[PDB]
RNA sequence: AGAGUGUAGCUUAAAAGCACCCAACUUACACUUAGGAGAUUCAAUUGACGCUCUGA
């Protein structure tokens, strides 16, 4: 009750988000949102880059958009899948890129472009 | 009129301004888990509970 | 006769019961008790429990439910407690170790179903 | 205090060649390939060998083999690249490709007068430049070389604090993209390491700790 | 680590069989692709 | 343009009748379960070895950048300044034959 | 050389509870199910074997 001393024991929606440029002021430099172009000839192996790659930005607490793909291309079929991914430091961003450098399997080229 | 309450509030010290930086909850479970922990737990308020209410043998089970 | 608290409607579980069964299943231990209304817990069966562990291989897998479901059978007709209410989540029910225990409550002589109260 | 300013590179070399699988991976990318031969949908090259068969043996009663063979033939034309580049030079460390699997590490003997020490690539810097452009000026300088590389961030990796007038040392972390390393028996004492025989050339405190952020892998 | 995301699957159940052709692009760099009527051997002209 | 290439193609549905035999023995997935467990444990030690390296950069970059702050007020404000040239950055994957 | 010390990643847990991984559904994540590995550093509260910091 709004006179008893236990008032608001139940509220919720302060703790519920009821709802890009970087963000570079003076101290916090912060990326804003990226676009990771895993292409490769195979689905397999995309697929899997892809899933472990959103295993690391999940368990290194990353914020991650989306995971779509865009449509192949007839040429041997081209595949590949987009990570979006935001929140580094950028100790973390060379931790983070060098980690994703090194854990390459074959052949698959790599990209950091922004957003559009 | 706002009075000030008893003892601590609970769901405060976890009130942050950035929530997306802390861990959550994924699951079902964890959240009922953790609810019955403090549900175990006596309160200030007024609850149902108030109306209602040696190595030798390590070493062989390990060798077991 | 007694009275059960036949409330509880909107919240999960409901307390409509004389005696309860609660399954935790841990990263390494599965427990399952049999309580009564107040909180307090009558039968317990634990695989932290020298004499049930030392026969496991592990102590979370179909198996161990299927012997833990044998052992709280077997606890609960020395114990007296005969009937039971109980009240799995969905996803929870499908699963087989625990639809293997509900096999080794019926197979023991401990009825899931507890009869009506007479008013 | 008179603070004497040396910053440093810990220059890396991206693997080419990828590393080579335990047994136990093959055993079970074997069976990998048996539960993808098991849940595959009837393909068409399949029917172009099975159903092609008994057809031609039903005319028979009343090619996918010379393909598979011309196959296999074009397969024993063209060698593969041997990926040891590696065994059998086994001294040539002055040379970028001594080897494939893991990466490299630049590192150069150095003359002091009060020591002679084998130290990651240093140089002297003034607080007027940018550390990033200290380790640029120290790739465009220290190696007289035409190598295209390529940094992650100006954030240092590893830094080590050793006196006799104070010294620091940081350690940056470079990644070679291209290189064109013209006249590869220079007279200086550039090793590449992957990560062992820098145990065997980094002695003291300040430079047997190298490899906890040099990526090991 | 280069063979944590080559020791992989098909996560779908409408597919077709699948084999390791080496290719070749135009650099002699012989890479195992899963592919269809399964050659050895590739080179783009 | 909201068009992807997760469609299925239309051929996978009629002459499903190749394989109908899967078929095992008792051996066969006593070692595929033993390789199973095995492959968990390999693969919870390879990522363990990539936390503990990973701790272990960010705790040596974390002393860098400090020792770098109480040794030179002027160059930690530039230390987290981040690069423009990270924009078109490009690396591809590893091959097996050299050219 | 001295100091701080010490349970798998974490514990004002006493051999546990949250973490972690593979297999299945998911483009993918997540949930869930099936499985898995885990430790009180060695000797009688004390000493010494392992780590960090402060010295040369």
Redesign the pocket.
């Given at each position: 009750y709004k006179t008893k001393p236990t008032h608001g024991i139940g509220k919720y929606k302060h703790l519920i988000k009821a709802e890009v440029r970087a963000i570079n002021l003076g101290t916090d430099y912060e990326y804003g949102v990226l676009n990771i172009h895993l292409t490769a000839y195979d689905?397999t192996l995309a697929?899997s880059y892809?899933?472990?790659v959103?295993?690391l930005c999940?368990?290194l607490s990353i914020k991650?958009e989306?995971?779509?793909?865009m449509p192949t291309k007839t040429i041997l079929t081209t595949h590949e899948?987009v990570?979006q991914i935001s929140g580094l430091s950028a100790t973390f961003a060379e931790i983070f890129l060098e980690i994703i450098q090194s854990s390459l399997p074959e052949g698959v080229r790599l990209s950091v472009k922004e957003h559009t | 009129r706002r009075t000030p309450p008893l003892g601590p509030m609970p769901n405060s010290d976890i009130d942050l301004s950035n929530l997306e930086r802390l861990e959550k909850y994924?699951?079902?479970?964890?959240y009922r888990?953790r609810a019955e922990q403090e549900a175990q737990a006596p309160h200030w308020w007024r609850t149902y509970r108030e109306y209602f209410g040696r190595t030798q043998?390590?070493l062989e089970?390990?060798q077991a | 006769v007694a009275r059960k608290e036949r409330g509880w409607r909107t919240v999960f579980p409901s307390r409509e019961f004389w005696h309860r069964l609660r399954v935790?299943?841990?990263?390494?231990?599965?427990?399952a008790l049999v309580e009564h209304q107040n909180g307090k817990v009558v039968v317990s069966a634990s695989?932290?429990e020298?004499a049930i562990?030392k026969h496991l291989?592990?102590?979370?897998?179909?198996?161990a439910?299927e012997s833990i479901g044998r052992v709280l059978a077997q606890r609960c007709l020395e114990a007296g407690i005969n009937f039971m209410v109980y009240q799995p989540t969905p996803?929870?029910a499908?699963?087989?170790?625990?639809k293997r225990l509900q096999s080794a409550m019926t197979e023991g002589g401990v009825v899931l179903r507890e009869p009506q109260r007479i008013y | 205090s008179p603070w004497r300013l040396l910053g440093a590179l810990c220059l890396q070399r991206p693997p080419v060649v990828s590393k080579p699988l335990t047994p136990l991976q093959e055993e079970m990318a074997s069976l990998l390939q048996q539960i993808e031969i098991e849940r595959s949908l009837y393909s068409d090259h399949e029917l172009r060998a099975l159903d092609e068969n008994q057809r031609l043996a039903k005319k028979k009663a009343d090619l996918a083999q010379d393909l598979e063979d011309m196959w296999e033939q074009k397969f024993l034309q063209f060698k593969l690249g041997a990926r040891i580049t590696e065994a059998d030079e086994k001294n040539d460390r002055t040379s970028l490709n001594r080897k494939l699997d893991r990466n490299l590490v630049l590192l150069v003997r150095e003359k002091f007068g009060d020591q002679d020490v084998w130290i990651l690539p240093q140089a002297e810097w003034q607080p007027g430049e940018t550390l990033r452009g200290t380790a640029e000026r120290t790739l465009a300088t220290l190696s007289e070389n035409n190598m295209e590389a390529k940094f992650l961030g100006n954030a240092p990796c590893g830094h080590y604090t050793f006196?006799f007038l104070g010294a620091k040392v940081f350690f940056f972390k470079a990644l070679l993209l291209t290189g064109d390393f013209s006249q590869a028996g220079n007279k200086g004492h550039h090793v590449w390491v992957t990560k062992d025989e820098l145990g065997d050339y980094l002695k003291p405190?300040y430079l047997a700790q190298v490899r906890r952020f040099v990526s090991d892998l | 680590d280069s063979s944590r995301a080559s020791?992989t699957?098909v996560?779908?159940?409408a597919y077709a069989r699948l084999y390791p052709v080496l290719l070749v692009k135009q650099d002699g760099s012989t890479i195992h692709i899963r592919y269809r009527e399964p050659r050895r051997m590739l080179a783009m002209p | 343009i909201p068009i992807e290439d997760?469609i299925t193609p239309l051929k996978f549905l009629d002459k499903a009748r190749e394989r109908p035999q899967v078929e095992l023995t008792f051996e066969e997935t006593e070692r595929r379960?033993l390789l199973?467990?095995k492959?968990?444990?390999?693969?919870?030690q390879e990522?363990?070895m990539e936390?503990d390296t990973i701790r272990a950069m960010l705790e040596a970059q974390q002393?860098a950048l400090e020792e770098l702050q109480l040794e030179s007020p002027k160059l930690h404000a530039e230390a987290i300044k981040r690069d423009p040239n990270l924009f078109p950055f490009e690396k591809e994957g590893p091959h097996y034959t050299p050219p």
């Open positions: 689905m697929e892809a899933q472990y959103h295993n999940n368990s991650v989306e995971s779509y793909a899948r990570v | 994924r699951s079902f479970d964890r888990r043998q390590l089970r390990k | 935790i299943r841990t990263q390494h231990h599965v427990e695989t932290r020298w562990k291989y592990s102590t979370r897998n179909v198996v439910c996803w929870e499908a699963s087989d170790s625990m | 006196k405190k | 020791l699957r996560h779908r159940q | 997760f379960a199973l467990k492959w968990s444990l390999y693969k919870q990522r363990k936390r002393e």
